[PDB]
Amino acid sequence: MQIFVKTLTGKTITLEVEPSDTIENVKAKIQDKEGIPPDQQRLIFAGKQLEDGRTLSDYNIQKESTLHLVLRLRGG
């Protein structure tokens, strides 16, 4: 199972994930591929921000699903 992650620059990166992986794990993969620390990234899918505790299965993120990587700034 692989999913997609589209950044705000138009780039689309591929991730090798399992349905049991948590949002945290996916953010660690995004960090390994792009370098952004987890606390600085925000993942959107199906209209909602993905929380750390949940799994991909909890959101019905199927094969080849598209995630949206967006900013998670602190105070400006």
Binding site: G35, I36, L73
Partner: peptide, 14 residues
């Protein structure tokens, strides 16, 4: 460590 452009921040650090 408190950036407005995470990408550029990580390039700067690493």
């Amino acid at each position: 460590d408190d950036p407005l452009v995470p990408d550029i921040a990580q390039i700067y650090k690493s």
